């Protein structure tokens, strides 16, 4: 997972 | 108690899809954002919005897109929708070149500024970070009226996106809309999106600091009636  | 949907057009839907940023911003490529956009494109189209997707915009481009859109003749439309996919900080979204205040993008549609959208709902769905906090989880018409902001996360928090499936908020929002978009009121849909994201998603990461985090969206409503896309 990546965050924005 | 329902918004009159009797217009030849549901309304315009602007999807700003920012994936690649200028190195001066130092923001990373948002993998999975094209999937979100395409999905969102299919959903809102199904709902009957006339959607147009704009890629890697810059702050000015964004402000223009919105200023111009607010300047069209919305007399034959029930509402207006705008979806923002990008990076972000508290109160601000990232253009490819920097950051612009969401307040500026939305103000164009104020009652005093978009008379043809007056008394009509103006919907903005925002997928972007709002800070760097992680949720660990636990086991006369007012000019500001008729707006609704469906944020993907809460003020001060990160927003999650899986490179291969898209952002949680959009995966959720699309499954819900696909199945209930034509039969449930907007608040019901978003409440279900709220529950879907909270219960069905949990970050997977190699950085323990970013592992197993949770997320809850945030809906702000200044609507004065119930909205049914039907």
CA distances from B230 to B4, B34, B53, B141, B219 (A): 9, 28, 23, 24, 21
Contacts 24+ apart (CB under 8 A), B136-145: B136/B212, B136/B213, B136/B214, B137/B202, B137/B212, B137/B213, B137/B214, B141/B111, B142/B111, B143/B110, B143/B111, B143/B112, B143/B113, B144/B110, B144/B111, B144/B222, B145/B111, B145/B222, B145/B224
Within a 10 A sphere around the Cβ of B1, how many other Cβ atoms?
5
Q: CA B225 to CA B154: how far, in whole Å?
A: 24
Q: CA B64 to CA B43: how far, in whole Å?
A: 25
Within a 10 A sphere around the Cβ of B85, how many other Cβ atoms?
30
Does the annotation mark B82 as catalytic?
A: no
For tokens 């907007």, what's the residue? B186
Structure tokens at B226: 């119930």
Contact residues, chain B to chain A, C-beta under 8 Å: 28, 30-32, 86-88, 127-129, 152, 158-163, 167, 203-205, 210
Which ranges constitute the DSSP H helices of chain B? 33-47, 59-71, 102-107, 168-180, 186-200
For tokens 């409503």, what's the residue? B221
- Of the residues B13, B43, B129, B174, only one is catalytic, namely B129
Burial class, B123, CB count within 10 angstroms (exposed 0-12 / middle 13-18 / buried 19+): buried
DSSP state of B11: E
Minimum distance, in Å, between the CA of residue A3 and any CA atom of chain B: 5
Does the annotation mark B129 as catalytic?
A: yes
B91 backbone φψ class: left, alpha, beta (φ>0; ψ -120 to 50) = left
**CATH of B1-230 among 3.50.50.60, 3.40.50.1460, 3.40.1190.20, 3.80.10.10:** 3.40.50.1460
For tokens 């949990």, what's the residue? B202
For tokens 């959720």, what's the residue? B172
Strand order in the sheet with B88-89: B88-89, B92-94, B99-101
Within a 10 A sphere around the Cβ of B81, how many other Cβ atoms?
24
């Amino acid at each position: 997972d990546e965050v924005x | 108690y329902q918004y009159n949907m009797n217009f030849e057009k549901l309304g315009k839907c602007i999807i700003i899809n920012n994936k690649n940023f200028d190195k001066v911003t130092g923001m990373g490529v948002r993998n999975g954002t094209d999937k979100d956009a395409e999905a969102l494109f299919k959903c809102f189209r199904s709902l009957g919005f006339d959607v147009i997707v704009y890629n890697d915009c810059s702050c000015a481009k964004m402000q223009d897109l919105l200023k111009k859109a607010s300047e069209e003749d919305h007399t034959n439309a029930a509402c207006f929708a705008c979806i923002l996919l990008s990076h972000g900080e508290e109160n601000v979204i990232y253009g490819k070149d920097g950051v612009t205040p969401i307040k500026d993008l939305t103000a164009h549609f104020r009652g005093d500024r978009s008379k043809t959208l007056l008394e009509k709902p103006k919907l903005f769905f925002i997928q972007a970070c709002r800070g760097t906090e992680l949720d660990d989880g636990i086991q006369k018409i007012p000019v500001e009226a008729d707006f609704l902001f469906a944020y993907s996360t809460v003020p001060g928090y990160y927003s999650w996106r899986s490179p291969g499936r898209g952002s949680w908020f959009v995966q959720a929002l699309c499954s819900i809309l696909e199945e209930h978009g034509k039969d449930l009121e907007i608040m019901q849909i978003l409440t279900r999106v709220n529950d879907r994201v909270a219960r069905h998603f949990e970050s997977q990461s190699d950085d323990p600091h970013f592992h197993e985090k949770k997320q809850i969206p945030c809906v702000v409503s200044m609507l004065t009636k119930e909205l049914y896309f039907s």
